[PDB]
């Protein structure tokens, strides 16, 4: 048995709002995985973020007893007992986006959010040409928000010496975050930029700088259709796209690999699947 797969051993993709359109990203490389090992992959999940309805229907899909699940977890904690009795009776999992990494999985592939602020860093920091005051609007408190902060921080003090950040709480909340950057930038006239680090950041801060008046450069956050409407138009400089195609595609290759075992080895643990900027010349290819 090689890598020719068996379209009987079914594998599958959990997800949480399983109709969002980020999963489809995902879930084409899931089934672009499977396009060539020729395996069964199937697209399943909980339609709303519940937690308790999460670990419901992936013990139906344990219940359908398939050799291999690359889950995304609601919680980094929540999803920690259910997985554990999936792979105590014989089934390889790993995580894809949102890891539960106190579990038993075997690998994680997502996002590295520290060299996501990184990236971010070195695409913003010439646009407003390594001068000037830096906003990074994010939730504080937020694990993945504060790596990518700290990536972008750290960038800057290493690359760009003349650039210093305000930090800029949205507080999960895009009313609270509007008020909170229209604060920023009444205080700090040497603003050139804002990092928008997550969802809320990627909505009140292009709301909090047009009602500024003010011309800075802007960039968002992952590829929703708000966002990417605003790079066309030419109202931010870009946004930074998550690797969701290579979440899908390399899940598959670790699970398949694990599932029957043609590696000696454990897998490895962790897969970077990288960000990409997403500006004029490829926000074609990240519509809907």
């Known amino acids: 048995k090689g890598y020719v797969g068996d379209p009987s051993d079914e594998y599958y993709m959990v997800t949480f709002l399983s109709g969002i359109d980020y999963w489809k990203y995902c879930f084409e490389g899931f089934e672009d995985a499977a396009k060539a090992i020729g395996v069964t992959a199937k697209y399943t999940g909980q339609t709303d973020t519940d937690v308790s309805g999460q670990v419901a229907v992936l013990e139906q899909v344990i219940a359908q007893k398939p050799k291999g699940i690359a889950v995304t977890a609601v919680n980094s904690t929540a999803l920690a007992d259910t997985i554990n009795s ?30 996501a602020g990184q990236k971010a860093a070195e695409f913003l920091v010439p646009l407003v040409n390594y001068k000037g005051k830096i906003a990074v609007l994010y939730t ?44 920023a930038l009444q205080a700090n006239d040497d603003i050139v930029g804002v990092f928008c680090v997550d969802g809320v950041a990627g909505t009140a801060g ?43 595609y390399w899940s598959l290759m670790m699970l398949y690999t694990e599932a029957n075992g043609l590696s000696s080895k454990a897998l490895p643990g962790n897969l970077d699947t990288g960000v990409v900027i997403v500006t004029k010349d490829n926000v074609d290819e990240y519509y809907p």
């Open 206 to 248: 292009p709301t909090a700088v047009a009602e500024s008046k003010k011309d800075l450069r802007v960039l968002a956050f992952d590829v929703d259709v708000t966002v990417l409407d605003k790079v066309k138009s030419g109202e931010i400089d870009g946004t930074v796209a998550q690797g969701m195609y290579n979440m899908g």
């Open 140 to 183: 504080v408190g937020a694990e993945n928000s504060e790596s990518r902060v700290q990536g972008f921080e750290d960038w800057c003090k290493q690359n760009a010496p003349e650039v210093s950040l305000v930090k800029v709480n949205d507080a999960g909340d895009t009313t609270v975050a509007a008020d909170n950057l229209a604060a």
């Open 86 to 115: 999936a792979i105590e009776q014989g089934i390889s999992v790993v995580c894809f986006d949102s890891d539960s990494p106190t579990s038993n999985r075997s690998a994680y592939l997502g996002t590295g959010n520290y060299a």
